[PDB]
A and B are shown apart, each in its own frame.
With several copies, the nearest count.
Chain A
């Protein structure tokens, strides 16, 4: 209503516009570095998960690892993966949930709080790495006793393209399941070492990465979209408040001027 009201509530939106715009380009560079980190993850999946495709490994209490991130301001990344885990957890209500990222721990803590036994923090700043992947995977084995569940499921977001993403699930098979797979014999594995045991702990770490890298790239492409739409909409308010200002500024001056003219007749 007043010039001061309009000057300070325009200014703040001029900032948000400049700001949300900066993080549209911030998370554009961050997309180039996370398309190469994605491809190197996805290419590596075909090579690792091919053995299982050929050995024909299938399943026979459940650990659910859910992956989004710590950050917000990224469309509906966290909201529609939590939506997936819920439709899944509806069928199997008796499962232990491990969360990677706070924005999915909260989404889930409000819906099935007691199923969550572990949370991973500080997760979506840089790209994901095998070190985070493996050290998350190591605690999984240690504190959750990962190696022992009949079924282990990673929930994550697959980048369909640049402009969208798909909430996806994948299984991890333990040592027992690998060994006792229909076409395991096709491969001449030396049964001395624990090739299945190692193959499991490696694939726990490895396919988590596969998931994190995609979810993360799904996110970086939801963030540069939500911010793209934010700048486009913040600029719409700057159009309203530029005009209202140019108005309220003139009105102020005219009304002080009427006061002055009245005071100057008498």
Chain B
């Protein structure tokens, strides 16, 4: 992967997974009779993973501007992040995407637990267009989750609106496997959600809606899709155009 990085190019590396590597390292170490410690890992297992993960980097202009990017994988046991290796790796990287059985069965796939996931780089690693419509998205799902347990009657106009919007954004964010979306397909879906244009549609149809809205946007408003893709930003005219294309699709 580093050949790419080192020659002004960019490569993604997925280590699937570092739990199992840790296990083989441990097997070597015990067999060579090196001193064991917590969980019988050698006392240099952390050095094993940080040697490895600090090699992912964005290089300076002086050195080609190439980059390596790492998605290490870690298996937890009963969601125990406090376990030795998970702890090492969670402290070495720049954030977690944290996935959960329960969210999965609920139907929330990717079963990403937002309140537990982070990108320590964050918004600087994000297409400006998506940062614009989804800056709030960060906020709401956070608010959704606090007020969450109220889903079970006699509620405020404040706390039910929170409920209605959240339920929908949560549904928007579902996705099928092997079908990643373009950035110009994401922002209009997320502009739609974030800015209230979904609160009327019943939760069963937010699926068929996303499908139908994108195709429609392709048929009629290929103009703004292109500009989103090409400029990567959203000017003021563009939000106003997006707003127009959205409101026109909802009413129909």
Contact = CB atoms under 8 A, between A and B. Distances in A.
Interface of A: 18-19, 22, 25-26, 29-30, 33, 72, 102, 105-106, 109, 243, 246-247, 249-251, 253-254, 256-258, 260-262, 264
A247 B80 contact: yes
A258 B40 contact: yes
Contact of B154 (A18, A102, A249, A250): A102
A249 to B, nearest CB: 8
A243 B79 contact: yes
B237 interface: no
Tell me whether chain B's interface is mostly helix, strand or loop, or mixed.
Answer: loop
5 contacts: A26-B153, A243-B78, A249-B82, A253-B39, A254-B40
B200 interface: no
B80 A22 contact: no
For the complex of A and B, 3 pairs with smallest distance between CB atoms: A106-B154, A22-B149, A243-B78
B37 to A, nearest CB: 7
Count class of interface residues, chain B: 10 to 19
A33 B154 contact: yes
Given A22-B149, A22-B150, A29-B155, A253 B38 contact: yes
Interface in B15-59: 35-40
A29 B36 contact: no
A243 B154 contact: no
Contacts of B79: 243
Given A22-B149, A29-B156, A257 B38 contact: yes
Contacts of A254: 39-40
Interface string B137-167: 0000000000001100111100000000000
Contacts of A258: 35-37, 40
Nearest to A253: B38
Interface in B155-194: 155-156
B150 to A, nearest CB: 7
A142 to B, nearest CB: 25
Contacts of A264: 35-36
B149 A260 contact: no
B100 to A, nearest CB: 13
Contacts of B153: 26, 72, 102
Contacts of B35: 258, 262, 264
